[PDB]
From a paper:
Clustered protocadherins (cPcdhs) are a large family of cadherin-like proteins named for the clustered arrangement of their genes in vertebrate genomes. cPcdhs play roles in many facets of neural development, including circuit development, most notably neurite self-avoidance in vertebrates, and tiling. In mammalian nervous systems, cPcdh isoform expression is controlled by the unique organization of three tandem gene clusters, Pcdhα, Pcdhβ, and Pcdhγ, with each cluster containing multiple variable exons, which encode full cPcdh ectodomain regions with six extracellular cadherin (EC) domains, a single transmembrane region, and a short cytoplasmic extension. The last two variable exons in the Pcdhα gene cluster and the last three variable exons of the Pcdhγ gene cluster diverge in sequence from other cPcdh isoforms and are referred to as ‘C-type’ cPcdhs. Moreover, Garrett et al. discovered that neuronal survival and postnatal viability are controlled solely by γC4 suggesting a function that is unique to this isoform (although it presumably requires β and/or other γ carriers to reach the cell surface).
The biophysical properties of C-type cPcdhs pose a number of interesting questions: Despite their more divergent sequences compared with alternate cPcdhs, AUC data have confirmed that C-type cPcdhs αC2, γC3, and γC5 form trans dimers using their [name]–4 domains. However, γC41–4 behaved as a very weak dimer in AUC (KD >500 μM; Figure 2—source data 1), nevertheless full-length γC4 can mediate cell aggregation when delivered to the cell surface by coexpression with a ‘carrier’ cPcdh. However, there are no published crystal structures of C-type cPcdh trans dimers. We therefore sought to crystallize a mouse C-type cPcdh engaged in a trans interaction and obtained two distinct crystal forms of γC4EC1–4, one at 2.4 Å resolution (crystallized at pH 7.5) and the other with anisotropic diffraction at 4.6/3.9/3.5 Å resolution (crystallized at pH 6.0). Right, close-up view of the gap region in the crystal form two dimer with the side chains depicted as sticks. The intact crystal form 1 γC4 dimer is similar overall to those of the published intact alternate α, β, γA, and γB cPcdhs and the published δ2 nonclustered (nc) Pcdh trans dimers (root mean square deviation [RMSD] over aligned Cαs 2.4–4.5 Å; Figure 3—source data 2). The two most structurally similar molecules to γC4 over their trans-interacting domains are cPcdh γB2 and nonclustered Pcdh19. γB2 and Pcdh19 have trans dimer KDs of 21.8 and 0.48 μM, respectively, while that of γC4 is >500 μM. Comparison between the γB2 and γC4 dimer interfaces highlighted two buried charges in the γC4 trans interface, E78 and D290, which could potentially contribute to the low interaction affinity.
Author numbering:
A (entry chain A), B (entry chain A): 1 to 417
Write the structure that this text describes.
Amino acid sequence: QIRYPVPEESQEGTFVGNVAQDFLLDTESLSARRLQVAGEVNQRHFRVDLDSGALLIKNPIDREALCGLSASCIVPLEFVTEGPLEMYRAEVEIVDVNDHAPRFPRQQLDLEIGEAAPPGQRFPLEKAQDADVGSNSISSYRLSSNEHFALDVKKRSDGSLVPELLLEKPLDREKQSDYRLVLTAVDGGNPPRSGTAELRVSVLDVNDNAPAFQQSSYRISVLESAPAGMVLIQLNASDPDLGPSGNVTFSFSGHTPDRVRNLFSLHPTTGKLTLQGPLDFESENYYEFDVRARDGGSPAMEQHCSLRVDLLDVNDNAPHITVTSELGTLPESAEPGTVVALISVQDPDSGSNGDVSLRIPDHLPFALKSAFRNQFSLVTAGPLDREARSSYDIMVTASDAGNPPLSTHRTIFLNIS
Amino acid sequence: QIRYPVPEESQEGTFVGNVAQDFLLDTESLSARRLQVAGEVNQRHFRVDLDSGALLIKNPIDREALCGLSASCIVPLEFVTEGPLEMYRAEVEIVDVNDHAPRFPRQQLDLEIGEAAPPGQRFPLEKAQDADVGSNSISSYRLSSNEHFALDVKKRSDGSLVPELLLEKPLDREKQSDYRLVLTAVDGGNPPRSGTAELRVSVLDVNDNAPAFQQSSYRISVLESAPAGMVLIQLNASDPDLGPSGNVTFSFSGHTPDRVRNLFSLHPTTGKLTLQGPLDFESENYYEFDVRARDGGSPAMEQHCSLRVDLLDVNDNAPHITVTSELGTLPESAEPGTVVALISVQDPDSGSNGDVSLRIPDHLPFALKSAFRNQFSLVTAGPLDREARSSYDIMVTASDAGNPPLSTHRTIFLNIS
Ligand SMILES: *[C@@H]1O[C@H](CO[C@@H]2O[C@@H](C)[C@@H](O)[C@@H](O)[C@@H]2O)[C@@H](O[C@@H]2O[C@H](CO)[C@@H](O)[C@H](O[C@@H]3O[C@H](CO)[C@@H](O)[C@H](O)[C@@H]3O)[C@H]2NC(C)=O)[C@H](O)[C@H]1NC(C)=O
Ligand SMILES: *[C@@H]1O[C@H](CO[C@@H]2O[C@@H](C)[C@@H](O)[C@@H](O)[C@@H]2O)[C@@H](O[C@@H]2O[C@H](CO)[C@@H](O)[C@H](O[C@@H]3O[C@H](CO)[C@@H](O)[C@H](O)[C@@H]3O)[C@H]2NC(C)=O)[C@H](O)[C@H]1NC(C)=O
Ligand SMILES: *[C@@H]1O[C@H](CO[C@@H]2O[C@@H](C)[C@@H](O)[C@@H](O)[C@@H]2O)[C@@H](O[C@@H]2O[C@H](CO)[C@@H](O)[C@H](O)[C@H]2NC(C)=O)[C@H](O)[C@H]1NC(C)=O
Ligand SMILES: *[C@@H]1O[C@H](CO[C@@H]2O[C@@H](C)[C@@H](O)[C@@H](O)[C@@H]2O)[C@@H](O[C@@H]2O[C@H](CO)[C@@H](O)[C@H](O)[C@H]2NC(C)=O)[C@H](O)[C@H]1NC(C)=O
Ligand SMILES: *[C@H]1O[C@H](CO)[C@@H](O)[C@H](O)[C@@H]1O
Ligand SMILES: *[C@H]1O[C@H](CO)[C@@H](O)[C@H](O)[C@@H]1O
Ligand SMILES: *[C@H]1O[C@H](CO)[C@@H](O)[C@H](O)[C@@H]1O
Ligand SMILES: *[C@H]1O[C@H](CO)[C@@H](O)[C@H](O)[C@@H]1O
Ligand SMILES: [Ca+2]
Ligand SMILES: [Ca+2]
Ligand SMILES: [Ca+2]
Ligand SMILES: [Ca+2]
Ligand SMILES: [Ca+2]
Ligand SMILES: [Ca+2]
Ligand SMILES: [Ca+2]
Ligand SMILES: [Ca+2]
Ligand SMILES: [Ca+2]
Ligand SMILES: [Ca+2]
Ligand SMILES: [Ca+2]
Ligand SMILES: [Ca+2]
Ligand SMILES: [Ca+2]
Ligand SMILES: [Ca+2]
Ligand SMILES: [Ca+2]
Ligand SMILES: [Ca+2]
Ligand SMILES: [Ca+2]
Ligand SMILES: [Ca+2]
């Protein structure tokens, strides 16, 4: 048929075509025939010049508002004359111009993705809008360089592009929690027009880290004389997760025997291990037990650590003197060398702290004899006369080889008859 | 020195040794010398027979209560005589018997392990107790066959065994949530004695599964006449996690345009997509949008699904008759063939539903002429005489080719002069 191209957004009065000449109307009859555009809308947008017979633009036309996403926009125009009454038809092709840039409906997009999202999961993106059609519509999407995310641009049945964010590699909030990316959409105009949007993705924390001790195990030496309330060690553990999932508390293992809990206490927040009671190298020389650090996650991650506390001997025991047997009363006629008492000594300490020596004052008529290790018998070493002295109080003194030495004193009472 | 072996837990009166004969004491002097055990404890456990001079057990001896975990248990015994007063020493070796079976302090142990525990993490176990020493103490640990856990048995500085549970492969509560294992501890006695304990481990859930749609995408066809409240589709998605982490809810994507939300609604629990308003094939022929299923986990996992709804044309529009120009009044002298009116018809439906035919009753002196598609002019087809009839009401009827057809009626009023 008769087709006139005219670009959209053309100014008022732009020449479309000589409709009178294409309808073969006589020039001299323009004022009588009263050629008019039919249709209220087309009379709003088109008019016929009465003098030349040319079809002119009255009000500028928006192709986007007229045809939307249709590929071709052709507007059939109807014309009317009188005398005689006649109708004519012609087609105006409205040509699209590139007066729309791609534009994201939101220029700021925010995503919250869980740290444990599986690779391959997809996330929708808002496509930019370009009201044009054909080569002037959106032609490509671009995603800035990053290491975990890529673009998966989808082609719809009509030719629309749909960008999707594809997680390619697993995330880790503990290494990087925020990503700032730019998404760009470009049309195929000349020159190409484009628009961008900032996509801020934050990684939500999963409790995927257990607490970590500074060392795998600790070994401690402490003197058995250490006072109650002494800090033996401060355990340090870190947990990189966020919030309560990064909150560390310390405790004894659940199966920790009572003999350990009675002597040691562990501060739940600071991890300071303190001493709660008396230690004794003589009964127990070392303790090994496990402690644990738990985070406040759901479910909780825990890590255990092995502790060994070695005790150091202190010279805290003086010798103990036991008089096994005692004559008590003795006749003055007894010959020198008579065994008067049996004495055993013991010292629970080790090394020089437990080596016992025994002594009595010299001026007495008695002597100490030893036939077995740490065993002494007290015997008569001189003559005895009841009339001179009727009774003896013999002071025996035991000493260990500690520094300073510890001494024990015991008196054996002996009557003479 | 003088050493006598005697087994622990020996009955009263068991022969240890002839101490008198080893101390070279005369048999005839037993009642006078009054050989006695020294020490209250040893007098509780040992006695000397006055007639034979043999050292005998008074009360049975527990080696475990005496030496604990020491490798060697040797008890120095002291003896005393009178007339003259003398002291002797000898050593009794108490030999351990295998009168203790390994026994776990708890025979039921329960562990709660997070599903996302990393392989290589270790978990303490309560070691069994065997009060014996040497080869009679605990000699081995065994863990029943399973696929995720193994045993890491530790050797302490003193020779104690510490069993630890080692996670070798990652867990998955969604495949198996409970493990029943038996831990066995065996000593090295003849015969070996052993004891077992049941360890029930439960796997605590992590929200590591997103909801899964039945299909990756759905495509729906619906007639534009479908009534409001019609269910177009029921979306089904499953989530295998536990509790709220397995609770699925449905929604439109956050970026879903308002033109979609106005026409369709999605039940958050059931996933039924219903129709909320009028559809119109003539203005919009299809809709594509994304819906998402989110679980109630922290953080939430989500999965999207693409929906496309195609509309089907219904013959819901009758033709529209527009009378472009109308003479209104006509002289009776006008020749036949005079164009009286200009008529244009349009039907927005497609195919046969939008093909228009036009007609008027036959007996009238008028006719319909068509020079362009869907355009008709009403012209005079016979002679006219005002005196016969002074005015005409001409009923024009348009019909589409639908089943059933839709009709439009319009009357043009024409005066004759
Ligand atoms: C557990 O941690 C505490 C605290 O350590 C703190 O964090 C670490 C990472 C470092 O930055 C450290 O400087 C911080 O205080 C440890 O306590 C500290 O341990 C130091 C040994 O590396 C120790 O030197 C320091 O005490 C000082 O020592 C100086 C002599 O070297 C003295 O002149 C001074 O007066 C202090 O007495 C100590 N500080 C405190 C406040 O405790 C602790 O050792 C860690 N535990 C384990 C088992 O490693
Ligand atoms: C979403 O799920 C529903 C419900 O499905 C239920 O779970 C699945 C795993 C099956 O066990 C199913 O039997 C359960 O009802 C689906 O609804 C059902 O879909 C069936 C198609 O597979 C459909 O046949 C059924 O309707 C019946 O159809 C029969 C004729 O084949 C009729 O004779 C009968 O009267 C029903 O009209 C329907 N049932 C219900 C209660 O809806 C639904 O299709 C799924 N959606 C998608 C998109 O797959
Ligand atoms: C980190 O946690 C501590 C301790 O939490 C306790 O142990 C948890 C495993 C769980 O059992 C909680 O219910 C316990 O509260 C928090 O310290 C507490 O702070 C409050 C004051 O706000 C105080 O009244 C409590 O007594 C404290 N708990 C203890 C055991 O002393 C601490 O607030 C947490 N850290 C942060 C940053 O919130
Ligand atoms: C599964 O969840 C539903 C819905 O939970 C809602 O959506 C969540 C994502 C979150 O926003 C919640 O705060 C919402 O409640 C539960 O259904 C609810 O049940 C209560 C009665 O107990 C009812 O009053 C609410 O209205 C319901 N919610 C809706 C949206 O209708 C349901 O109980 C959960 N399943 C289980 C097994 O607990
Ligand atoms: C968007 O991208 C286009 C081409 O990629 C540029 O021409 C424009 O300046 C904007 O950066
Ligand atoms: C893409 O980048 C431009 C700046 O070049 C912004 O204007 C836009 O908002 C988006 O960040
Ligand atoms: C424990 O194990 C020992 C040897 O392994 C057995 O002898 C005993 O019967 C029990 O099963
Ligand atoms: C090991 O197995 C035995 C049964 O043979 C139980 O007695 C014990 O409690 C543990 O289950
Ligand atoms: Ca425009
Ligand atoms: Ca345009
Ligand atoms: Ca454009
Ligand atoms: Ca991590
Ligand atoms: Ca943590
Ligand atoms: Ca984390
Ligand atoms: Ca002591
Ligand atoms: Ca000591
Ligand atoms: Ca001492
Ligand atoms: Ca015993
Ligand atoms: Ca035993
Ligand atoms: Ca045993
Ligand atoms: Ca899993
Ligand atoms: Ca889930
Ligand atoms: Ca799970
Ligand atoms: Ca319609
Ligand atoms: Ca229709
Ligand atoms: Ca129709």
